[PDB]
Amino acid sequence: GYIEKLVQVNRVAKTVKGGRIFAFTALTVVGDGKGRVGFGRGKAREVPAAIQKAMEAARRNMIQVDLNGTTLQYPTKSAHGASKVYMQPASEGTGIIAGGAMRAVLEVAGVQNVLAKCYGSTNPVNVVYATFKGLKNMQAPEAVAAKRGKSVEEIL
């Protein structure tokens, strides 16, 4: 589906000769409010056209996320580049408390109780990779129990 959310806008450039050609980039994540997200990056020549391009690439190559219901399954920790990310599920009344670019991922996924923090280099185009290695590699235990459930899930 489609619920859109913008994060970043830049002004990249390019020197040719004579002057300097400008261009705009944008980063936009799209989710469904249930656990299907997708991010997208587009470059164009103006703001109202660079956002439209980044929205279209978001709703291609999406991710199914197996959330527990407004929370996560377990504390995990993933990294990409020089960016390290930590996330652990929380109680009911606590909302989402994260920084800038992990709120926009964790809104549209539908989770509400995420309690996150990012270390290392804060790059909004690169902390998103650090988040999607984490969420796309969840497990959601298909087991008979948890304190007993290590005889039917390990064979899954």
Place this chain on the structure above:
Amino acid sequence: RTLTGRVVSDKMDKTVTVLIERRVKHPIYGKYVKRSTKLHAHDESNQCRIGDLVTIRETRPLAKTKAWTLVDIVER
């Protein structure tokens, strides 16, 4: 209350000196160091050798800096 150490000195008169090892843990780094302890056990009969393995206990002070005594020699 009863300790155990090994003798390093026979130079003084009726006075012996022990080493009592000890493993205390470091308070913040979680590792067991070894830090020593050196007492003056009151010898009584001038008959212990450098390198023994003896046993001490605490009495009232006999001279200054000498309040421990000798229980018995355990092994040579």
Place this chain on the structure above:
Amino acid sequence: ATINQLVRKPRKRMVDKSDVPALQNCPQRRGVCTRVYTTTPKKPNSALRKVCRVRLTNGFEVSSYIGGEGHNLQEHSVVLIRGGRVKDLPGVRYHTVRGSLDTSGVKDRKQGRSKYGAKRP
């Protein structure tokens, strides 16, 4: 570093020092003034800043800065200085409270009067 090195030489946290070295742990300080220069700023500006030099009750001889729009500050007059680092001028590290002892504030000012010390009309 391994654990068996930190036991032998633990991590010693480095310390800073005060950007206001005079007026040792106190918010204000008085002093009598000596000279009223009018110096020039650094390169990317163009102005003529007004700088007085003060001898405190500590005995220190430090330059200061005077704000506002016009000052009555003839020499040998007491002031009351406070901290504040002017980025423009070099060596200037202290402002000067208006309206406190001798500087007597400014006049015809109606925006932000608790700064610079102006009354209410």
Place this chain on the structure above:
Amino acid sequence: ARYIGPKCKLSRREGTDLFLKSGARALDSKCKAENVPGQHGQRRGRLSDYGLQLREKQKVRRIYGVLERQFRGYYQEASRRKGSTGENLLQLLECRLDNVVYRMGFGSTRSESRQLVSHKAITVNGQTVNIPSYQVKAGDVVAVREKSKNQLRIAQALELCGQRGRVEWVEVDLDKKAGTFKSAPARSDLSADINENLIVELYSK
């Protein structure tokens, strides 16, 4: 310190009904609630992300009439109690005495209920209370003092109860004027325009 001044102007910036004017005459006829106040009431665009959370916090804080020194005091008692600080923050604003006088219907505005408490005209357990912060419990028999039962401020306001209904955690008696706070409210009688997941997140950073 209260807030004394214009009152459409608060409803005119946040862009909602907000229930501040007294009568059932008309919204947006005394008010003209089409625009942001001030001179530049026509230009708009892109409320900031911090500015959205402050806009939600300032909305809830102007329905009820608190100030921020008091409002953070309720936020500490929310995080003390067990579970769901968003719901607990609302139920400490529902049990307050100036709200329950408004829920029983002894006033038109909520600011009228603050004045009826302040002039000692309201009792709680059979004894006089003149504090607009009194946290009432389950089963407190709020009644009206006999010296002022003849005020037209109370009599007229009961015809303004017709456009309100009963909130189904109180009960009011239109003869002796003695309401009964039945129990705590649930998280269904409160409107969905307020959000319990923006005020909690504002007080982190």
Place this chain on the structure above:
Amino acid sequence: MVTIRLARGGSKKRPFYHLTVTNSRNARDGRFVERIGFFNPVATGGEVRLSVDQERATYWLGQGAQPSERVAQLLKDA
């Protein structure tokens, strides 16, 4: 001597005493051996005025503890 006497806690014009057993040459609010009860003169509603425990008062008074003037009656009125 050792003695059983009254401390003083609470705000202005609302006292709340404490049956302590102290050495005699101490302060009022200073050190004590132990504490055994309280005394609340302005007790109203669900509050209890006298709350002395008879076990330790059996113990100390048999070993030469010397009570005060108010404590001469508060142990009596139990």
Place this chain on the structure above:
Amino acid sequence: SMQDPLADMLTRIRNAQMAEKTVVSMPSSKLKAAVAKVLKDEGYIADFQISSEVKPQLSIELKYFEGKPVIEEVKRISRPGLRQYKSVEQLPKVRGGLGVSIVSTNKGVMTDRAARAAGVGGEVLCTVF
């Protein structure tokens, strides 16, 4: 001169599940032969064999539910030179109770779910997911 044997059994397991091997053979001991019994009962390997006479070996067969293996990570906790000991209160839980943690207690080498039922603390060894 290898200083720690049990961080070498776990290293060969982690490496063989990237070369997509099936059988792994390392030298044995009376502790490694008890750890692999615990990983079998929890279920991460197929079986194990102590089959020699004077250099007794340990032949472990690995599982693959997918192209991805069944063990995804494993790390040694009580490395020689740290010696991590835990009581029952401060005993850790991995992944909200979905991994296993192997604790050498007074009643033999058992997992974290077993000793916490018996109320016996001890020494952690590893945190297998």
Place this chain on the structure above:
RNA sequence: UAGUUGGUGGGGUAAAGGCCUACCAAGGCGACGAUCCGUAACUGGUCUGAGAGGAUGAUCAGUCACACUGGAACUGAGACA
């Protein structure tokens, strides 16, 4: 570092001790930081921190140290007041 570190004999004090003295002996401590320099009354606690920690010891409470500066004893249950 030479009553310095032990031993012996005698004194001295409510009380063990180089506490003191007479001879004997040449020991004792130290890189696990002695010695020396610079600063500072310690503690239960306060202030931040998710936590680990980090700073800090106003009011209240416990302990120590002084009573213009430097000494000194008496009286006495108990002071070097």
Place this chain on the structure above:
RNA sequence: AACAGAAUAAGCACCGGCUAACUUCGUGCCAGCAGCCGCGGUAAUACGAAGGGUGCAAGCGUUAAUCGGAAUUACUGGGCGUAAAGCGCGCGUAGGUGGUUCAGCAAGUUGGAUGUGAAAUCCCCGGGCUCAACCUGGGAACUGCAUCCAAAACUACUGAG
């Protein structure tokens, strides 16, 4: 409890970006501003004013001083091919770490009991002042240290291979 009458009682910083909230008028590299980026050379949403607006309120602002943010002294929680960072290379004392079978022991380790860890403070459930601050009853906690009892997987010590 009664009487008087709406009478007796509102400021302060900010509005270019971080950062909630804006346009005209003076000024023209002058005066001036400033926590950092930096504005001012004749049209200044940054200086000085005027309307408007936003934050807080019997207070609001600046300065001084600590801890956070700082995974920026990293035990929990970092690094060393080129960004700062591997001694010019050896040998070796103190010290740190120890292949594999049994057997013993119980110093570490785990579990339990007792003595202690002053009262206050913090935390939890209550109770009193019209509410709250404040006062106060009962519990937990004070991570500790010591003495006993038991267990024996791993480390240590001991005996044999």
